[PDB]
Amino acid sequence: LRELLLPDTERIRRATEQLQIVLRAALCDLLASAADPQIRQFAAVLTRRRLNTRWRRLAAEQRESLKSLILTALQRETEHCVSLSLAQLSATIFRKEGLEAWPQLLQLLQHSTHSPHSPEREMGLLLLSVVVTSRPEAFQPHHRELLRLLNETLGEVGSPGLLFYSLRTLTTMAPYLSTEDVPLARMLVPKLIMAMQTLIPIDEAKACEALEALDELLESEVPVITPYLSEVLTFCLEVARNVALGNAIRIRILCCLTFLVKVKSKALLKNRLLPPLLHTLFPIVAAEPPPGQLDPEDQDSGETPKHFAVQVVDMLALHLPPEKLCPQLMPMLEEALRSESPYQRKAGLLVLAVLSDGAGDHIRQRLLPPLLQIVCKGLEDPSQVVRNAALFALGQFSENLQPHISSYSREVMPLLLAYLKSVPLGHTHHLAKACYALENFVENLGPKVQPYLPELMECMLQLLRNPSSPRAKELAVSALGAIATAAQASLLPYFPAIMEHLREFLLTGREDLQPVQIQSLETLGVLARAVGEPMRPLAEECCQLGLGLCDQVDDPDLRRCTYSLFAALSGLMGEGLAPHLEQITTLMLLSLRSTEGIVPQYDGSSSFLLFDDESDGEEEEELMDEDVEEEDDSEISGYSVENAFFDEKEDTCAAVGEISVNTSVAFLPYMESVFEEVFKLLECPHLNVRKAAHEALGQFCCALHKACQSCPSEPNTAALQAALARVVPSYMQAVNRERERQVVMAVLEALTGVLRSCGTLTLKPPGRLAELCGVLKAVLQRKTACQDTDEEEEEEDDDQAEYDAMLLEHAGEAIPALAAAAGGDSFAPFFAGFLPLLVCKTKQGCTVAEKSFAVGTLAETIQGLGAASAQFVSRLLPVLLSTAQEADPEVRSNAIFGMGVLAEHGGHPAQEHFPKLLGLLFPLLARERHDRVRDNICGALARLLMASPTRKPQVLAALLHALPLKEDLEEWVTIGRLFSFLDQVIDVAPELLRICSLILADNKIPPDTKAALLLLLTFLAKQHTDSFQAALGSLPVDKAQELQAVL
């Protein structure tokens, strides 16, 4: 036994590379060298791999002897690491063999885990945890027995090892908890909390590996932790606010709190668990950093619990109504703002910035005028930290409060521009913060940027045209791209200089300018999206440059932002991508299957075997399908996912969808190749990748449908039918089963976009409508799994979350699209059940936005249903009539539009209400001041005049008295259709003639309206033509010149 397996001197290499490798120039039989501690550890590590590689070549004669040797060894070991290694070896033997093929290991576990000796219990639990971890599905039957064992063992607070290993066993078993096993876990939860409290001060690593169990138990699809939510939250708060504790454990606890809030936030809202949660969270956000040190985000040239506490606050804001959060947070926040300590201001600004996300509406309409809190105070605060927080808060404000913040541009822009001018060069971190804020504000301005365009262009060309650091050029390029997005067509005067600067950046092959290459490609794509025709001659040259950098250096951020460039260029180039379509379809599919994001981390014993068995026999092991001879869990010390490859997939999916939609003829040979991988991504564990894949399949369906319209061949329509039958079931299955809510909104939006484009092809298979309507009715009824079944238990019809209104609106937006696809005849029975929910949403006293959305959805569904609304007019008329009697512009406009279209498409059952309908339109015409609502009343009156049974016995004169159509050009088609429905045109001649004269210059007015007038002029040009002379004489001569022009 002269086995010198220990390091000796630094010449351990002289041992490893030379000895124990020269066997050729029988060791398995006596690999039981029990001489000195941790040499048994080496022996077990080597034996694990040896048996993994050659288990099936030992037959059965020595199998039992080896098993007995291992069991004897496991009952006499005294150390811990070697005991863990022997447990690993035992699990490896168990994993490759059958469940009942080792009838003594189970007996040992059952006997030891119920033994009255503490070392026996520790050795039993350690081995049990390792065995269960190795093959979790083996212990599927005995969940009740193993849960009972865990509940008995977790009460032993004296020994930390038993607690830690029982918690590891719970970690492994937590995902596979069934509904019938809930009471045992519910009883075990308090023991888990006690074990956590005991294990926190002993060691941080074990505390983290047991927080693993707690986190796994948080989300299990079964109601395990809900009855003890108060105790769990109290423990999390108690451990989270311990300032003397470590940062890693606090970060893990804050992630646990985030998951608690996300899964069930309403439960802690009904109880008085929210005020303590805020009182514990806020000091963490305003925590003073160590003296001398600075926060990670405030460095001159992820780690702290401050960011994770801010994230918890953000998640609380997302999953909670503002009316239940703002009153309980505004006092604390307001007291925080007016504080001497700068970090209190930083915490307040961060909390406000992340509150602007999930409470966008409440701040936007009611708390946006108090914008002085950020721009006028923190942006010029004496403390630099408060200035950085103010810049971040302004960026979040200008990115979340999108439509109502551009009104304050006149006062925000000059100070922001002065701030950018005040930042000196060489301060690229501060310049980056200011440029982030500037871009986020500029992107939404649109036409408002034109007054400030020359100043921005000069400021951003000062950096590029003069010597500056490479870090200060990508920021200028990004700001330039934002300015290009803002000024879509006003950027022509500066276009040549910007283009030549971008080309100069792209051409130069200097290795220190990679990020500005990425930004140049991105801004080239942004320019292609924004500016149109003048870039078409130069667009072809941009494809060569985009691929030229994509094949010189390999970078996930370079392959990305190039697919976006081609997606942008496909809009204007059109079918010109065919030569490059093959090259951009490959090198993109490879990015879609690239698994380089998940790189394993190996920190353990080094491999010294490096030997492969040589045999010449006839191997029969292939009969067992599930070969376990491969390298499974080779001392995996966790994984380190790179957050740059999933961000590559999320963008390449959208890029390929846009390319397929644009290039709809040349993409057919590659559509089948791309579709399979895009579908394969639907099971990705990434939120954004799943969202992008769901949004990309719908674009594939639309592109394939328009290709089928282009070439009406049998293979094209067969492929379209197959693609729809593969996508629509996936869309329906991912709505009422997928927990992530952000995916569900995207899926509903994609489904709405498919039903509008594909049309009747979607619903051709029988029974598809019956389940699509069921799904859309389940979303409105809050029965889906994404909404957590109305956050468990029940509700008393209270105010729901701010972000669930968007989900309900997306669900209800597909009803008009669904109606226009089923033809109306077959959609009536389903609309009968759909009606009560929409009527409830528009009940008096509810939200204004929901009221308007419900009324508009009813109007559009009337439009889609058409002649099948005869049985629904009776129910619909009271709702629209009551809604048209409010004091809101949008709501009343939608009500009038819906009432008019109901009159148009109501058929015979709607005719009996015509005198009553006319008796109410006259008072609304005069009293109303808004231009939109009077235009919609005009359109409703026109449509009502169209649906005349025989004739109209004046409505026509009063309607033609005023024609102020300004902001509703889409009603001009109905107005034009109104004319020529077939004598008193003398009185109403001047206004219609002047309307025609003014609309001659404008191309926005449909030509059909003008053509209608000529028919009635020519028809009446013979009978009673004497009135035309009087009409011409009455008109002013200046209008007479334009009148005589057309003849």
Next chain:
Amino acid sequence: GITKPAIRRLARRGGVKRISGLIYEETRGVLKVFLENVIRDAVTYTEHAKRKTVTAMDVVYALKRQGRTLYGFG
């Protein structure tokens, strides 16, 4: 350069039931020869492209020289 379980799995997907012990070295040699040919063609394309780094396009172009083998005459 290919592990034995990978060879067994590849044979499994091909429908092979029983394998002799001498298959591993032979299939490693076959893979080495195939990759030598493909890398040769890819390097030829890369040199024709005046570049010092082989990309995916070069490999795709190189794969076209081996031709296509499909069952039937489709």
Next chain:
Amino acid sequence: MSIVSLLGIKVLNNPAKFTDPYEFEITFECLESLKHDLEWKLTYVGSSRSLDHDQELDSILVGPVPVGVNKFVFSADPPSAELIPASELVSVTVILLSCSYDGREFVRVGYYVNNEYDEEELRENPPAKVQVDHIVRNILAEKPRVTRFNIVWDNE
């Protein structure tokens, strides 16, 4: 996209005698006349350990290219059994038929042929000396393996 593509291969004598000349029926289509003629080669693979140990039976050229079903007679001698290794003679091997234009091959079809005794009488007592007349070979033409190489046809 090859101008001339194979459609199907029909074998008239299968199983055939070992010494019986190989004869096949070939159906193809001619879109346009080719200035140079097409030559087909039949090769027998004796030993798989080396590629230089194979033997080419012959090479024949046909001038006219008829459109449709073609009438033609092979002029190839039977493969030499003597040059085949004695150990590997009674074993499976492959035969390759290819059509080449100007020395550039574009279609190649291979067939597995098995040299096995047709009677249990010799299998029960296999002698050291092998008898060529008692070995019957069969060709699995039911599952052909075709390889297509794309080549340039017109300068364009």
Next chain:
Amino acid sequence: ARTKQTARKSTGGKAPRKQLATKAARKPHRYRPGTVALREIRRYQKSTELLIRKLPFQRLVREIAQDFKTDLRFQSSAVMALQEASEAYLVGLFEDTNLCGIHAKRVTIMPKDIQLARRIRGER
């Protein structure tokens, strides 16, 4: 017509800007995922792993690459394409070898069957 309320989070637009220059819109390079995320990442990686392990394949490709020319680098996408091509070629070769064995009234494949499959699959 109906007033369209699309002014909320810019959803439905052409494409949001990446904003990866400005601190990627507020550790991105390397971060440790959560337990529930780690388990799902493990499941996804195991579910889509290719037959040939990637590290030995890149090592072998590098071996032949330096056999041809020293200091010759390979794109990762090129290595992935080579790996997929090798897997497809090996599966085709193995199924042809199984056919050769079946036709030969044998159930065990041998190196001569591999050579015959190579010869019939197009020489080269």
